[PDB]
């Protein structure tokens, strides 16, 4: 079909931010400022956030063969839109101690931003490619954004060959699958022959790398500990929520993840991913570690949600909500260890010995990152307590015995360091933009502790958004 | 060990004083003397247990 | 014979199972990264027997 | 109506005494026993104004009081807290133990204060809550939330931050023992509800749609372990309770009177309430599983209480004994074995409160933990150690003590239902007299030469004797006159065992 305007409408996030883009590399050519820079790139995605109204006020629609837009896909926006936002105001405060070429950060966080909003609206199997590579190439040069250290560069060419390797598996699968089906969009696939779900396995583990599966875990930590902390918190939050919306479309629509030939394989991936999550993440004495232990055990109980989307219609808010908790626990989490390094430093010495006091130190930051660790762990009245309890709940819908005794086990082992953090913010003591940071990781305590104690509110928004 | 040895005799009293709760009702002194043999046509070997454990 | 609690010992097993392979699993992890590639060609390896057994 | 403001005065205080703590610091001291003091008025005027002797046969369903608002309406979980005439005790109870909570915490002014007591008003309001609950999630939320504060207490308040082995031993034991079993209980929860909603077709989190649900024979035994697993690891049972004497040792003892006198008691109030008429013929089926736990605890705690050298691991391991009786009280068919096992917990709580007290009052008078190193101290100390003797004479069976009422009705309506195992049973009694006296012989009888420091004693002042001279008095009237509490619990009591009895 052609171009018309309920199509431009429903374009528009994707419109806006290639705007910024564009004005953002001419404004760096014209005078290569910070501020201007800085200002520009977060206008552009605060404009993304109000046009989230007039995308919805157009309906449930398709602009391409290559895109569907649903409500599903404006949450999804949204929250891809908050940790953009959220990490420029992170990395401003980072960036003033870094010695030069400080403007090219903004710009690869708004092409991050276009390949995150792209996986959002998914319709197509070509589509998923160009969205997962977009959000990567940022993601393979800002991690290696202040190469003078030893560890970022270590971290970058990490990440950046195992990147394109998974992104490899992954069109050797889409391939073989469309060796069979005669188109690849996600509704014309599977239209339980081996080649469809040989395929099938071979995007599981080009998918399963960016998701932090177990298998595929090994990059989480590494990289969490040599990227910077404002790269961090995009890589911890708007990634893996980006690219869980496009997997699990994915498996609504094509018949094929009907079956249960795949849904055990996936099963067993949840299962150790929570286990060997879990289990390794006691050990650990750095922030940054710790915070890339506990992503492959959140990533894991979403995946318990997705074995049994096809079995009753809670899944679908199940995944939704505990998204959005996910989102505000990381990101106040991340922005603590971030404000911390309020100059540049070189490296960054942040451990989990470095962590006593923290309290007599700064009161009000250590407040955050209690409230937000014990928001990742399931205390109650903390945001992700309500995740917890509908990914129990779905489990429980679905007969998946062994899958939700995993997550309450994993629970139980995972509550020792989530308050060894808590506890150790309280021993013995051994300019604007950065007021600016503290209100953004403030604000966030304010969330997740009223959408703890009174979470109806959210849960609203999430069944406007879902079909 | 007089207290010890004093407490397992009370344990030994209190025995036979569920056992008559148990078969008689009334811990009355009295109305348990005119009301034992009238609860008692039937059976009388449990009350053996019942009296040498009072004992 | 009770002066140390028994029971209270014999139910941190839990506990002291999932410390040591906790630390098995750290050590299970290396920084040579031709090794994390190996692991990513084990993954695909055991994925596709997963799905061929059904 | 009250009931809403009622679980909410400990909260607004928390936030009243942080407040005012950059006005004063000696005002949240002042502050905390004005409140108390009218969580207790609302709490004896619910008693008072009530009809506490009501009808002995009115249903499952009753209540003097009650409160019913929406709060996530989705799966129609509610805040419904409700007030029964048991559960009226259990909040003059923890309204008490507030009071004497918030008085041992006098003169103690420390860096930070107003930090201490809002989270010592938030763990005791959780406890209220919990006892007011009868939505399911809402009691889930509230048994949850009384349980991360302390953690807190536990770490910051065990040792200010000097020696490790105040938070990752203790403290850690205590958090994760309880969280692991919590949330089995939740899936057991969720279980339930699924059922009944294939059964009906109504997302209900409430107990009175949820306790007649109709379940299968095999599938309703399996909730019934999930809902006993959480309640078994709050009170001592057998195989889960190394927590207990690991916290209690630790825990300044004031948090230890909120870790043992009231936090004991909502694992068998949730066995009265939640887990014995939902599921009948499970209970049942599980009946002498239980009696045999009963048993291996009563004679278990009594064993590892003689053997130890400490005093608080010591009055910790007397609570593991006291609860045997209560569970073997619980899983019969008799009323007189329940209201047997209200007068215990009652007792148990206020014969475990003012231990605790003297014995943290004697280490800060010695500045020494060890039993065996002192002795003979009562030629130095006036009344410490009088008190002390009546409150180890209080723990036995000794009439003229709520204790004995207590554990001894229970007795009474077990061998009621059946004989051998309540025949074993009664032995407690033995085993309680060697470790009470032990407790006594070790600590205050012998001579002063058995440490240099039991050589220079200091005072012991007013407001301490009085919070003591109330609680023995108190408890001497529990054991002479049970008659108006007993009186108030009857229908309660009643109708719960007529459902046992009549479901089955």
Same mark, same amino acid.
Request: hydrophobic share 55%.
């Given at each position: ?42 206008? !552009? ?23 569907? %837009? ?25 960036? =003033? ?6 403007? =090219?950060?903004?710009?690869? %966080? ?43 560069? =270590?971290? +970058? ?99 094929? !993840?009907?079956? =249960? ?21 006691? +050990? ?10 506990? +992503? ?74 209690? %409230? ?11 945001? !992700? ?74 849960? +609203? ?7 | 060990?007089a207290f010890?040895?004093?407490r ?48 | 014979?009770? #002066? ?18 906790? #630390? ?31 | ?22 006005? @004063? ?31 002995? *046969? ?103 931050? *000097? ?17 692991? *079993? ?87 109030? @949730? ?34 209480a ?5 005093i608080?691991?010591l009055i910790?391991?007397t ?28 007792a148990?709580?206020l014969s475990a409160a003012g231990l605790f007290i003297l014995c943290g009052q004697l280490?800060?008078r ?5 039993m065996?190193?002192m002795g003979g101290l009562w030629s130095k100390m006036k009344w410490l150690p009088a008190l002390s003797l009546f409150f180890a004479v209080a723990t036995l069976g000794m009439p003229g003590t709520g204790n004995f ?27 309680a007299s060697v470790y009470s006296l032990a407790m006594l012989h070790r600590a205050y009888f012998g001579?002063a030469?058995?440490?240099?420091? *039991?050589?220079?004693l200091?005072?012991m002042?007013?407001?301490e004797l009085?919070?003591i001279l109330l609680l023995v008095v108190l408890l001497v009237?529990?054991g ?25």
């Open positions: 079909m052609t171009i018309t305007p309920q199509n431009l409408i429903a374009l528009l996030p994707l419109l806006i931010v290639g705007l910024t883009v564009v004005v953002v590399m001419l404004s760096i050519a014209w005078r290569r400022n910070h501020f201007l820079n800085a200002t520009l790139s977060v206008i !552009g995605l605060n404009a993304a956030l109000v046009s989230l109204w007039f995308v919805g006020q157009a309906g449930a629609m398709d602009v391409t063969p290559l895109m569907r %837009v649903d409500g599903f896909a404006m949450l999804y926006t949204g929250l891809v839109l908050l940790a953009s936002l959220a990490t420029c105001t992170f990395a401003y405060p980072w960036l =003033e101690g870094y010695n030069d070429n400080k403007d =090219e950060f903004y710009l690869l %966080v708004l092409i991050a931003a276009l390949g995150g909003i792209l996986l959002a609206n998914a319709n197509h199997l070509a589509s998923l490619f160009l969205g997962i590579e977009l959000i990567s190439l940022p993601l393979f040069g800002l991690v290696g954004y202040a190469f003078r250290q030893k560890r970022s560069l =270590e971290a +970058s060419i990490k990440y950046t060959i195992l990147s394109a390797a998974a992104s490899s598996f992954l069109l050797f699968g889409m391939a073989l699958v469309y060796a069979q089906s005669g188109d690849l969009s996600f509704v014309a696939l599977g239209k339980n022959e081996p080649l469809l779900l040989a395929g099938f396995g071979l995007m599981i583990v080009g998918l399963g790398f960016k998701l932090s599966l177990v298998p595929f875990h090994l990059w989480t930590p590494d990289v969490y500990q040599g990227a910077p902390a404002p790269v961090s918190t995009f890589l911890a939050t708007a990634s893996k929520i980006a690219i869980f919306g496009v997997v699990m479309r994915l498996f609504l629509y094509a018949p094929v !993840g009907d079956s =249960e030939a795949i849904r055990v394989v996936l099963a067993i991936i949840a299962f150790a991913s929570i286990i060997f999550g879990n289990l390794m993440a006691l +050990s650990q004495t750095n922030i940054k570690r710790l915070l890339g232990y506990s +992503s492959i055990s959140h990533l894991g109980y979403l995946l318990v949600a997705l074995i049994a989307l096809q079995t009753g219609e809670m899944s679908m808010e199940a995944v939704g909500v505990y998204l959005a908790g996910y989102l505000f626990s990381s990101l106040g989490a991340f922005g603590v260890v971030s404000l911390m390094s309020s100059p540049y430093r070189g490296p960054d010495a942040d451990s989990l010995f470095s962590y006593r006091g923290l309290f007599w130190h700064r009161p009000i930051l250590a407040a955050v990152m209690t %409230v937000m660790m014990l928001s990742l762990a399931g205390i109650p009245m903390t945001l !992700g307590f309500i995740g917890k309890f509908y990914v129990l709940a779905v489990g429980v819908q679905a007969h998946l015995w062994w899958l939700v005794g995993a997550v309450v086990v994993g629970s139980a082992i995972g509550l020792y360091y989530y308050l060894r953090v808590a506890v150790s913010l309280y021993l013995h003591a051994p300019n604007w933009q950065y007021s600016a940071g503290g209100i953004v990781v403030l604000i966030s305590a304010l969330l997740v502790l009223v959408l703890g104690v009174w979470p109806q509110p959210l849960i +609203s928004i999430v069944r406007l958004a879902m079909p | 060990k010890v040895v004093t397992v005799g009370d344990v030994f009293l209190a025995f036979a004083l569920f056992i008559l709760y148990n078969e008689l009702g009334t811990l009355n002194f009295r109305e348990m003397v005119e009301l034992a043999p009238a609860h008692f046509a039937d059976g009388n070997n449990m009350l053996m247990w019942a009296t040498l454990m009072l004992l | 014979l009770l #002066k140390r609690d028994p029971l209270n010992s014999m139910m941190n097993i839990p506990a002291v199972l999932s410390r040591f392979a906790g #630390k098995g699993l750290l050590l299970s992890e290396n920084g040579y990264l031709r090794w994390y590639v190996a692991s990513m060609s084990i993954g695909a390896v055991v994925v596709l027997a997963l799905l061929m057994v059904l | 109506m009250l009931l809403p403001w009622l679980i909410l005065i400990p909260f607004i205080g928390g936030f009243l005494c942080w407040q005012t703590e950059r006005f @004063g610091v000696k005002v949240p001291r002042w502050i905390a026993l004005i409140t108390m003091g009218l969580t207790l008025a609302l709490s004896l005027q619910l008693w008072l104004q009530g009809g506490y002797s009501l009808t002995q *046969s009115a249903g499952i369903p009753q209540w003097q009081s009650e409160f019913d608002m929406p709060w996530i309406p989705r799966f129609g979980i509610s805040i419904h807290l409700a007030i029964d005439g048991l559960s009226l005790l259990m909040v003059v109870l923890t309204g008490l133990l507030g009071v004497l909570a918030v008085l041992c915490s006098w003169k103690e002014i420390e860096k930070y204060q107003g930090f201490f007591h809002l989270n010592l008003m938030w763990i005791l309001g959780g406890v209220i809550g919990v006892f007011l609950a009868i939505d399911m999630f809402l009691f889930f939320f509230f048994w949850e939330m009384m349980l991360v504060p302390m953690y807190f207490l536990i770490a910051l308040w065990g040792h200010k931050a *000097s020696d490790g082995k105040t938070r990752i031993t203790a403290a850690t034991k205590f958090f994760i023992y309880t969280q692991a *079993s919590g949330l089995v209980m939740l899936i057991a929860i969720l279980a339930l509800v699924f059922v009944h909603y294939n059964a009906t077709g109504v997302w209900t989190f409430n107990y009175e749609e949820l306790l007649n649900t109709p379940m299968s024979s095999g599938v309703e035994y399996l909730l019934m372990l999930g809902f006993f697993i959480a309640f078994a690891v709050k009170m001592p049972v057998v195989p889960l309770h190394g927590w207990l004497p690991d916290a209690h040792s630790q825990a300044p003892t004031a948090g230890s009177v909120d870790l043992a006198g009231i936090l004991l008691k909502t694992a068998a109030y @949730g066995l009265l309430r939640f887990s014995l008429p939902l599921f009948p013929n499970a209970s049942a089926e599980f009946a002498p599983i239980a009696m045999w736990l009963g048993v291996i605890g009563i004679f278990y705690g009594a064993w590892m003689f053997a130890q050298t400490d608080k691991r910790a391991y609570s593991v004994s006291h609860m045997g009786f209560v569970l073997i009280a619980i899983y019969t068919g008799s009323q007189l074995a329940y209201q047997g096992a209200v007068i215990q917990m009652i148990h709580g280490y800060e010695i500045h020494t933990r060890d065996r190193m009422v207590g554990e001894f009705m229970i007795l009474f309506g077990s061998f009621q239902v059946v004989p051998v195992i309540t025949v074993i049973s009664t032995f407690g009694l033995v085993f001579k030469k058995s440490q240099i420091a *039991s050589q220079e200091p005072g002042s007013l407001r009085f919070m009237l529990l002479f006159y049970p008659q108006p509490i007993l009186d108030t619990s009857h229908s309660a009591i009643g109708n719960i065992q007529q459902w046992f009895v009549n479901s089955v």
